[PDB]
């Protein structure tokens, strides 16, 4: 059973914390764990005017969001990796499970 | 024929088919990534969405 788990979040430091904890857990559980594949991050750029009406110097904002996505690959049966993945999930980090 | 001529006008497409989902106005809509509001409401509620003006 080849299994893929995706660690997609908005904040990056809690993402590094949970990915390091998952890699450490797969290391201590005597399991063949692959390295964390770092996908190219996606920048959310939409610009708008400052003032609500139409007068003033034409000044704009640059609002930004960065979403980071990570990949961890394992070779393990289903129930043990469910038991691993259902431990200590952050509210700002979303995990999703896929099977090949 | 009040029932059949009250709103027989097709608002299938066009600008008035969509509206702001915060304050229901039809000017300056942002449709990108499905926000579906005007610019003022997005600027007022932009912090809880998570958009920061870092750049």
């Amino acid at each position: 059973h080849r299994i893929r788990i995706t660690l997609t979040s908005r904040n990056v430091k809690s993402l590094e914390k949970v990915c390091a904890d998952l890699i450490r857990g797969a290391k201590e559980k005597n399991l063949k764990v692959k390295g964390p594949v770092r996908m190219p991050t996606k920048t959310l750029r939409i610009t708008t005017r400052k003032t609500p009406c139409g007068e003033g110097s034409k000044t704009w904002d640059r609002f930004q969001m960065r979403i980071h996505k990570r990949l961890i690959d394992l070779h393990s049966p289903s129930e043990i990796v469910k038991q691993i993945t259902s431990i200590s999930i952050e509210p700002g980090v979303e995990v999703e499970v896929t099977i090949a | 024929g009040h029932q059949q001529l009250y709103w027989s006008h097709p608002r299938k497409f066009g600008q008035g088919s969509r509206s702001c989902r915060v304050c229901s106005n039809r000017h300056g809509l942002i449709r990108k990534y499905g926000l579906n509001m005007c610019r003022q409401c997005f600027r007022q509620y932009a912090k809880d969405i998570g958009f920061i003006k870092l750049d």
């Binding site: 908005r10 969001m65 979403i67 996505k69 | 499905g34 926000l35 509620y45 809880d48 969405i49």
Partner: peptide, 19 residues
Amino acid sequence: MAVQISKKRKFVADGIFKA
């Protein structure tokens, strides 16, 4: 399920749910 919105729209929907 048959909608499957993209990864940007999921975070946009979650933040606007919080708002």
